[PDB]
Amino acid sequence: FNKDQLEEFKEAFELFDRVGDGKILYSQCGDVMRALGQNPTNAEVLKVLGNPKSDELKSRRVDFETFLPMLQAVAKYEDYLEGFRVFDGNGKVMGAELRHVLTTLGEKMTEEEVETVLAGHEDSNGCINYEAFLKHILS
Amino acid sequence: ETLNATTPHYVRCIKPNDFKFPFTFDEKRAVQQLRACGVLETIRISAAGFPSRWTYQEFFSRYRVLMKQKDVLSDRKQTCKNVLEKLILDKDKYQFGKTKIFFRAGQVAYLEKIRADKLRAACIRIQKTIRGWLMRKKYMRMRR
Amino acid sequence: ELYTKYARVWIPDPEEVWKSAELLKDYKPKVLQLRLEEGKDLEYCLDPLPPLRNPDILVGENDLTALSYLHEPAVLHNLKVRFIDSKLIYTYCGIVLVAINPYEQLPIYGEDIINAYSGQNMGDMDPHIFAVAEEAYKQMARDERNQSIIVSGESGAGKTVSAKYAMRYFATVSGSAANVEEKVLASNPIMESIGNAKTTRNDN
Amino acid sequence: IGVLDIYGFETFEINSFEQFCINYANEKLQQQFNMHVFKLEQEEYMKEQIPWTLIDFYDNQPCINLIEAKMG
């Protein structure tokens, strides 16, 4: 990232800086990466963070300059489609099944995150057009 | 010579606990009872064969998760022959009967593991993408 | 090999013949890191492997041969779970029927269930003594050849209860009035008085 | 239709002629059971058109010959 990129990213970082010291928490580093359009795993975030311990993960703070190499390291469709097609072959996916698997397998999310992103995107049968929802969430 | 004139059907009774407690099951007693009834050496003999026998359609239902939408044919038997011959490279682990797939002991667990591993990798990829989308939107809220 | 992270394994234990464990780090060609229910790591060593565990979908199935790993702890687990949590006293192994004596009376012997089994094929149902009796009763009609039910175990296990219900089944599906059930049951006290003993390890 | 009620295999701390007889009877019955299962498996394999040579037969006759045969 160049100075222009660093300035836009720093402004975003400061928006996520909730203490005013120019720093975020380890637990916010992933949040910042996600805020910039990336979809990193929890594992990649923890790896670039240096596998922090619970105590420093929840209370040790790092500024943007330490975050930047980590964002870089993390940074460095048909499979995504097949991943959604696992739970289908009429081009649909049950909302209940996607909700269950996203909240119980893998890097489990909360029911509220899934309800929020899924609100208004599933139809009356409780079916999700996964190609359209996926394109929407990837934009 | 009385039983050989006849067609057998077998029952085994096991005693779960020495104290006649209702619906309690002492593993140390029950293992001994199962050995004494020959059930365990029966199972050891069965495990040498093809224990696990699956109908083509229920197999296809279970393992389409592992199957590319290209590769499923109209012909179930040929579809499964293809898929299984890729998924389990040693052909000696299964036989294609007229009506059922026969598996050796262990291989249906292998197929279930590789299915679960595919399903997990897909779920991780999708859900991490949804997490990064949602927090990207929370960033747009904070910019607003 | 496929001893991977989050592979479950069985480990031998003095107190309950096998305990479940989970392989806490991948195996690679001497000692395994095992996570136990009792404590997050206690460690197990490999000799000049632990029995791998069946996947969770398979455990609890009606027929022990449906398991993919066939061995003492998986059998013991399936019988234990089916008995304790589902109160199903009957299970299949190959042809054999395994009857786990509950020491408790049960509604499962009722005449409605006798009707429910009559005319079924063997695999169509969860296992029950009536399904063996029915398989015999159909083969006796389809063919001249005679049929036997063989009951084996210790005498405490309750073989007499199995035979009692197998006769009740025969009587009911025959539609018979006759009177064999009462007499055969009333024969048991003399046959036990003459032919029956107290051993070092069992009474009667 | 016959209902045969019989004792299982038997083993004690101190072990004697009564058990030797019981275990011989249980060897004979287990041979019959292996006969029957093997036969029904050859039938099921010919139902599914699978070559018979894949099913191996496990045989306890070397143990029965140790007991009941001449010089046993």
Author numbering:
A (entry chain B): 4 to 79, 86 to 97, 100 to 150
B (entry chain A): 649 to 792
C (entry chain A): 5 to 33, 36 to 54, 59 to 187, 190 to 216
D (entry chain A): 433 to 504
Reported in the publication:
By using the actin cytoskeleton as tracks, myosin also powers cellular cargo transport processes and can serve as a molecular anchor and force sensor. The myosin motor domain consists of four subdomains: the actin-binding upper and lower 50 kDa (U50 and L50) domains, which are separated by the central actin-binding cleft, the N-terminal domain, and the converter domain, containing the long α-helical extension known as the lever arm. This coupling ultimately enables the amplification of small rearrangements at the active site to large, force-producing conformational changes of the lever arm.
The structure of the actomyosin-V complex in the absence of any nucleotide in myosin represents the rigor state. In addition to an unoccupied and open active site, the actin-binding cleft is closed, facilitating strong binding to F-actin, and the lever arm adopts a post-powerstroke orientation. By applying a mask including only the central three actin and two myosin molecules (central 3er/2er), the refinement was subsequently focused on the central section of the filament (central 3er/2er maps, resolutions stated). While the actomyosin interface of the rigor state of myosin-V is basically indistinguishable from the one in the strong-ADP state, the lever arm orientations of the two states differ by ~9°, in agreement with a previously reported rotation of 9.5°. The remarkable similarity suggests that the same set of interactions is maintained during all strongly bound states of the myosin motor cycle, despite their varying F-actin-binding affinities. The actomyosin-V interface comprises six structural elements, namely the cardiomyopathy (CM) loop (aa 376–392), loop 4 (aa 338–354), the helix-loop-helix (HLH) motif (505–531), the activation loop (aa 501–504), loop 3 (aa 532–546), and loop 2 (aa 594–635). Notably, our data show no significant change of the helical symmetry parameters upon myosin binding, neither in rigor nor in any other state of myosin.
